[PDB]
């Protein structure tokens, strides 16, 4: 049950892992796209407790929540429909499976380099069963000008 439209001007995403520069570049892209609200709703980082990381929306400082567990981010943000997965090759599989355990996510972007092929095939199988679009591993992501940017595509501003 894959969707034709993956990104839009209202698409909100969850970033797995602390990628401050990538999220800030996403927000800068969002601001120069005249987007109403930021596309990064929350971040997931297992190694710290819940807090709020401060980013820039244009010239004004804003707070984006950072959750230790993905479940908290999923519960507190039902509007998120994309997850850019910044886990390493040893953590991309488990994080992606846990994400596919949540039905609100329609698209997952995997940035990790060097996933074993069998694990990737299992990811594809579960994505096909769940109807989730996977922007395959070993990628920078994608860009939809005016709507959404995945991580570090297009460089900086």
């Amino acid at each position: 049950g894959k969707s034709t439209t993956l990104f839009s001007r209202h698409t909100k995403a969850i970033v797995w892992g602390m990628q401050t520069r990538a999220v800030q570049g996403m927000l800068d892209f969002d601001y120069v796209c005249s987007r109403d609200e930021p596309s990064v709703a929350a971040m997931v980082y297992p190694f710290t407790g819940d807090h709020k990381q401060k980013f820039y929306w244009g010239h004004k400082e804003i707070l984006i929540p950072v959750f230790k567990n993905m479940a908290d981010a999923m519960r507190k943000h039902p509007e998120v429909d994309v997850l850019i997965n910044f886990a390493s090759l040893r953590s991309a599989y488990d994080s992606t499976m846990e994400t596919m355990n949540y039905a609100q996510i329609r698209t997952i972007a995997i940035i990790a380099e060097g996933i074993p092929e069998a694990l990737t095939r299992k990811l594809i199988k579960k994505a096909d069963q769940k109807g989730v679009t996977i922007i395959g591993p070993a990628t920078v992501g994608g860009i939809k000008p005016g709507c959404f940017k995945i991580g570090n595509t297009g460089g900086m501003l």
Binding site: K54, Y56, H59, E61
Partner: protein
């Protein structure tokens, strides 16, 4: 100049929420100092503004002030007062002596308010009854924090406890945790008369009740303020007055440098290291 024209972006490393001094008039948590003074909200109100960012009701502020009054000092024999007195007799300034006294405040000294509040809150939030709480505490091998007095008992109550209890009863809207603590107290006094609710225990339970029932707080905010150490701050601020009084008293008395007697020290050293 670049920030004035807003062409450079730099993140702010600090975030504050209690006081604004940049503007014309000083602001205590969104409230100007003159509006603080014209509403007859004193030490308790200013403390509520600076610590909780709330305008507490008048009885809440008065209860906070009463708590500061009862914990102001408890003689020179305690660890903090002793350290303050020794630092003062060593010729140090007020800040050094006060700080030496304050740095003993923690688990064994000065932490009974926070510990009592935490223990009673954990007991009451669980569905266990006061008798089950007492039995669980006895089985766990730990004494109930906030129970037991030197010489006061039933038919000889602690006067600070009675004063605070009388106010909280007549002014606080609802005190479920205080009633729970009083049931635990009557159980323990049936066990042994001196096992009455302490000033620390009553202050802790009544402060939790004030946070949970004054209407200015949610359950999560009150729990967070208990966890952060608001009662540690209450005891520290109250006892700072007594420690400064001890410093001033030692300076007036012109007490000389103190050195502990050797007969009071047991010297047990290795034979030949």
């Amino acid at each position: 100049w670049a920030r004035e024209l807003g062409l450079i972006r730099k993140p702010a490393s600090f975030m504050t929420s209690i006081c604004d001094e940049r503007g014309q008039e000083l602001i205590y948590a969104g409230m100007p100092i003159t509006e603080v003074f014209k509403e007859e909200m004193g030490i308790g109100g200013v403390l509520g503004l600076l610590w909780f960012q709330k305008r507490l009701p008048k009885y809440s502020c008065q209860f906070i002030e009463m708590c500061l009054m009862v914990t102001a000092d408890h003689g020179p024999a305690v660890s903090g007062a002793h350290n303050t007195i020794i630092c003062a007799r060593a010729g140090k300034d007020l800040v050094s002596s006060l700080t030496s006294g304050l740095l003993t405040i923690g688990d064994r000294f000065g932490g009974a308010l926070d510990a009592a509040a935490k223990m009673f809150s954990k007991a009451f939030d669980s569905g266990i009854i006061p008798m089950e709480f007492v039995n669980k505490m006895k089985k766990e091998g730990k004494l109930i924090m906030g129970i037991g007095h030197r010489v006061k008992s039933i038919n000889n109550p602690d006067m600070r406890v009675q004063i605070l209890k009388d106010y909280v009863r007549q002014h606080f809207p609802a005190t479920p945790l205080l009633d729970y603590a009083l049931e635990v107290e009557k159980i323990t006094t049936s066990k042994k008369p001196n096992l009455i609710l302490n000033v620390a225990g009553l202050i802790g339970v009544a402060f939790v009740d004030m946070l949970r029932n004054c209407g200015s707080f949610t359950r999560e905010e009150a729990d967070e303020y208990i966890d952060i150490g608001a009662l540690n701050g209450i005891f520290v601020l109250g006892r700072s007055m007594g420690f400064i009084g001890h410093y001033l008293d030692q300076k007036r008395l012109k007490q000389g440098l103190y050195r502990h007697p050797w007969d009071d020290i047991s010297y047990v050293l290795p034979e030949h290291m």
